Design goal:
The protein is mainly α. 82% of the residues lie in helices and 0% in strands. The protein has one domain. 0% of the residues are buried. Belongs to the Toll-like receptor family.
Length: 50
């Protein structure tokens, strides 16, 4: 809306930051599913039969 072009940097900056949050969010669930994590992983581990 603003004749200024710099404004573009903002719109792009917003997404650039949101992307970082995606990496942190993964941790939020990691905690809630801290136990289930191993429960499921166990299936993948034994499946290999190392």
């Amino acid at each position: 809306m603003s004749v200024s072009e710099c404004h573009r940097t903002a719109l792009v900056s917003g997404m650039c930051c949101a992307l970082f949050l995606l990496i942190l969010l993964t941790g939020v669930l990691c905690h809630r599913f801290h136990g289930l994590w191993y429960m499921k992983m166990m299936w993948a581990w034994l499946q290999a039969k190392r």
